[PDB]
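Narrative summary of target 7.
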Amino acid sequence: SKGEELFTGVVPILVELDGDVNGHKFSVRGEGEGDATNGKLTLKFICTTGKLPVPWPTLVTTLVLCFARYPDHMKQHDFFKSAMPEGYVQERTISFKDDGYYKTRAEVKFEGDTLVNRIELKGIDFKEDGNILGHKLEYNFNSHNAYITADKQKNGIKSNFKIRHNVEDGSVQLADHYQQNTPIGDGPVLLPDNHYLSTQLALSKDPNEKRDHMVLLEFVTAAGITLGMD
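Modeled conformation, tokenized:
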């Protein structure tokens, strides 16, 4: 359980994603750093294939929970850091209500000194004039709490949560997330108790950037476990 020692300082991050939504292929590369002591993520993502065929906020959850800030009375429930440096596989099914769904498989692991998140995404059954392919979502992201439960029969964790995307007309697009995480190596991992992760986000643009891009600042903090007289 010596994986949390790798996140004591600032760790560079590399994010690479290859996507295909209704045949529209695209690639996204992101770079930055994570500060798990504060639960802070600072990243800049670039669509290297030109124009992103999906809204940037719909990829936020796909584009490194090992940088969450776990309180001292909850370090024994940090599965993500315990699986490092070998890392873990993160698979998700994101079903957009009245629209298509994403299928993602990611490998979050250490490659040298850089935390790397390499993802393969596939989107199926999307409407060409819907909120996704039609670019009808606002460029923002609300605060959310993601409940984490343990999966002993898979030696990992699972989680299901609903992301509420703001639509430009005033409505809300629901994105039902179903997540599974399993370690890559064979070492011991910490199987947590029931808790949740609190996440806040700020999206912005780089004024000196001409490519399609997203500047991201994110805070992730763990909670839900009563401290007590500890």
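The two ends are 21 Å apart (CA to CA).
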